[model samples]
Target chain A: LRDLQYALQEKIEELRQRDALIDELELELDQKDELIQMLQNELDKYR
Target chain B: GSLRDLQYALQEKIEELRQRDALIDELELELDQKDELIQMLQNELDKYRSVIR
Candidate 1:
């Protein structure tokens, strides 16, 4: 039982790390979307 | 049992990560497409400037 408890704790830590990584990626994705929109607007002026 | 519960939670977390990974992949592809489009537009603008000169 103690072993299982230790293993579970490790898994929880891993999940926390994964969650943080996902959050960072999501923030970057939002920034990229904004950049894309800005570029599109610039292109529209040329049309 | 407590161990069983922990195992189930781990499985759920793993599945969530898988979905998140797929989403990241899709976003990366979209970003690449947008970058290509911006480059094309910049090229077009340069062409117009040359024509005006």
Candidate 2:
């Protein structure tokens, strides 16, 4: 039971860490989309 | 005996996480190319804007 408890604990920790890494990448993707839209508008002004 | 089943579940979770990580890597690479294009176009746009002013 003791070893199982620790194993589950570590696994959950790893899961959370991976989830956060995924969130960071996705947030940047969202940010990049906005910047690309802004740049598209800026470019349109010149045309 | 219970630990036997637990091990399989753990392996299942690990497999799912691995697949998600791979998917993320794939999406991130496309974003990298977009970042490159954004910077490249921005530079060219600035050059033309400057000469016209």
Candidate 3:
């Protein structure tokens, strides 16, 4: 996604953004997992 | 040599994205299943509304 020399100059910033993206996705996934688990538990109780 | 290596690394990144897409698809399927279950439960509960009243 980065250009050539521009990327070279900003490699650290680019990597930081990439890491943030990955972390955000991971946090979202964790939340979704927790929500799914809670719903599953509630469904089981209703059953 | 460096260009080749960069291409290879890009390939790996693409593969990683593809794998994440697959996982997202799986999550979508799971969400659909949960939605169906919730809807069914709600429908059944509606039938019991008269009993509660």
Candidate 4:
């Protein structure tokens, strides 16, 4: 019983790490969005 | 045994994250469209300046 629970604990930790990775990826996506916006504004200046 | 429960939880969390991601995508698309409109307006403004010159 205890061993099974410990195994579960490890899997839970793995999931937590994956979730953190997802969050990091999402943040990167947002940064890309900001960069796109900034570029668009700069382009508008020349137009 | 224990892994099963953890898998279930992870799956649930992933589903929630996906939903949030979909919303973000929608917002990003809307912003892109808005930026395109603004660019069009700026071009029109430039055209006016050229005509005056």
Candidate 5:
């Protein structure tokens, strides 16, 4: 049981790191979408 | 029994995370293609500029 508890703690730490990585990945996607929209908006002027 | 249940719960959570991250990765790939989208738009504008007034 004590070993399981320690294993759980390690997994929990890994989960926290994974969650933070996903958070940044989402932020990057949002920024990319913004840039996409901005360029599309400029393209509209040519049409 | 409590430890058994806790271990299974973490496995379940971790598996679901793989699903969600894979979904997000698809979007990541789709967004990258828009780099070409931006380039195409620029190309069109350049063509217009070359045509000149």
Candidate 6:
């Protein structure tokens, strides 16, 4: 039972780390999206 | 033996996740450079527009 509990804790920590990585990736993608929009706006100024 | 097997599998998955984290970091850095390029272009565009006006 203790071994199973230990395994469970490890799995939980792994999941937490994955969640944090996903959050960071999402934030970075959001920044990219905003930058793309700004670039588009500048391009439109030429048109 | 079963617990040991489970532990190894989780370790493998964790390692893969770490690799993915590193890849994301690289991608984020590339995007930062792209953002800087866009800003530079925008500045140039503004300068041209002001000259035309």
Cα RMSD to the true fold for all candidates: 3.2, 2.4, 5.5, 7.3, 3.2, 4.1
Q: Model 3 off-target regions past 4 Å?
A: A1-47, B50-53
Better of 2 and 5 by TM-score: 2
Question: How high is each candidate's TM-score?
Answer: 0.66, 0.79, 0.53, 0.45, 0.67, 0.57
Which regions of candidate 6 deviate over 4 angstroms? A1-20, A23-47, B49-53
Best by lDDT: 2
Q: What is the full ranking by TM-score, best candidate first? A: 2, 5, 1, 6, 3, 4
Q: What's the lDDT for residue B53 in model 4?
A: 45
> What is the alpha-carbon lDDT for the whole of candidate 4?
0.64
lDDT of 4 by residue, B1-53 (tens): 66677667656666666666676666667667766766665565577577764
Candidate 5 deviant stretches above 4 angstroms: B48-53
Model 4 ranges with Cα > 4 A deviation: B1-53
lDDT of 2 by residue, B1-53 (tens): 77877787677777877887897787789789889978977886797777765
In the order shown, the chain A TM-scores of the predictions are 0.90, 0.77, 0.72, 0.75, 0.86, 0.88
True contacts kept of 5: 0.28
Expressed as tens digits, the lDDT of each residue in B17-42 for candidate 1 is 67766876776686677678767766
* DockQ scores of the candidates: 0.38, 0.47, 0.17, 0.11, 0.36, 0.26
RMSD of 5: 3.2
Question: Per-residue lDDT of A1-47 in model 3, one digit per residue for the tens?
Answer: 34543444454454456556666666666666676666666656656
Model 2's CAPRI class?
A: acceptable
**Which pairs clash in model 2?**
none
- The candidate maximizing TM-score is 2
Clashing pairs in 4: none
Shift in Å, residue A31, candidate 5: 2.0
List the global CA lDDT of all models: 0.72, 0.80, 0.60, 0.64, 0.75, 0.74
DockQ of 2: 0.47
Worst 10 residues of 6 chain A by lDDT: A1-10
